Amino acid sequence: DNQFYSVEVGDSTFTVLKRYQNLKPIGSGAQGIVCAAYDAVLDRNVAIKKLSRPFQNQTHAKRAYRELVLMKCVNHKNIISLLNVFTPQKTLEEFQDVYLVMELMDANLCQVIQMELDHERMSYLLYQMLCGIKHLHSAGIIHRDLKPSNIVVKSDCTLKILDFGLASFMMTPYVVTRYYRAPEVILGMGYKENVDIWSVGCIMGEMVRHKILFPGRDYIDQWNKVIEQLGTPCPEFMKKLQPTVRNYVENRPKYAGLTFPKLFPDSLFPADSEHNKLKASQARDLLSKMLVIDPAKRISVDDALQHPYINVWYDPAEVEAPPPQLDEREHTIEEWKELIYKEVMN
Numbered sequence: 001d002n003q004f005y006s007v008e009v010g011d012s013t014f015t016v017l018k019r020y021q022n023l024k025p026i027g028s029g030a031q032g033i034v035c036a037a038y039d040a041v042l043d044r045n046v047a048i049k050k051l052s053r054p055f056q057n058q059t060h061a062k063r064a065y066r067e068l069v070l071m072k073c074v075n076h077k078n079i080i081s082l083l084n085v086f087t088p089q090k091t092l093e094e095f096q097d098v099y100l101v102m103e104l105m106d107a108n109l110c111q112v113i114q115m116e117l118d119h120e121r122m123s124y125l126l127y128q129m130l131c132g133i134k135h136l137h138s139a140g141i142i143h144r145d146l147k148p149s150n151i152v153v154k155s156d157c158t159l160k161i162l163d164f165g166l167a168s169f170m171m172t173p174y175v176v177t178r179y180y181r182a183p184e185v186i187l188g189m190g191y192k193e194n195v196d197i198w199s200v201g202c203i204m205g206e207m208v209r210h211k212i213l214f215p216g217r218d219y220i221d222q223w224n225k226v227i228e229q230l231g232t233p234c235p236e237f238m239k240k241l242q243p244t245v246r247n248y249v250e251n252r253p254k255y256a257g258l259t260f261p262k263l264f265p266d267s268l269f270p271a272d273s274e275h276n277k278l279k280a281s282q283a284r285d286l287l288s289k290m291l292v293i294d295p296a297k298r299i300s301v302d303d304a305l306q307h308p309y310i311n312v313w314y315d316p317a318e319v320e321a322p323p324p325q326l327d328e329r330e331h332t333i334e335e336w337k338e339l340i341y342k343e344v345m346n
């Protein structure tokens, strides 16, 4: 008679509704554990993420409350949608965990980057990323923390973006990934819409190079790998920095920056036919417009969707979407509990 049952997937206890059967682990981020299962009601396979007590601290509660509201507020083919929310607990006092159900995908973008892709599939994945990004901007949402681990794909090359970005001490052993954050985020300078274009550039470069473009233990090593490859930024970008961080960055050794045919040689691109030779140059051209330190010179999302390497998928009903207030604050763990609990009850 109990409409719930408990399964032990790895070390986490998955207490889900009886409609979800055959639970199997598929992924693991930092906010919860994800499982695949068969939804006996909808007759389809779903992905279930379990958020263990998200009100336990401010970082977990701010992120959980954020993505819980936006996923019923924003819809798109390239932005993941909510299928069902539930908690096995009955009252606010007993409230513990939140389970998010979404349509099951086939792989992470990290698994796809490890593969060798043609120009058709690379351009299509990059087209779907810019479509969902522009819908986020159309809804007044800027990500600033795009990364392959939060992007899922299917075998038919369909792409969807999992999370909604940044708004922070972490009491956890798992470290966050910062290799894809724009220089303005690395140095704290303020941003516009095109801050996510940089993250697209690091991903697109990684699909070609099969190596993290700007690795490092901290922002100290990361900014080094940026200027050692793209070059020391121009003084107009310099003066836009805060005086403290402007001094440190200006005091670094000056680099001319390697050219883009050198950062991405032709041997890394499908270059056997004439059509493949042209697409390799168009791809490298999009890398040149996206991977630039200065945001004022950086290409925008709308201009990237019209780039020759991308606009082969251009379709008006697919690019844009309707545009659908502001709940940013600081609460206690008890206040955060009720705020998240009522969002689950809806």
Ligand SMILES: COc1ccccc1Nc1cc2cnn(-c3csc(C(=O)NC4COC4)c3)c2cc1F
Pocket: 026, 027, 028, 029, 034, 036, 047, 048, 049, 067, 100, 101, 102, 103, 104, 105, 106, 107, 108, 152, 162, 163
């Ligand atoms: C509700 O979820 C969320 C909501 C909000 C933010 C994040 C999430 N997390 C999240 C969602 C999804 C959907 N798909 N995958 C997936 C990766 S790999 C694979 C697979 O191996 N599929 C094979 C087995 O049958 C084909 C399937 C996910 C992995 C995830 F971490």
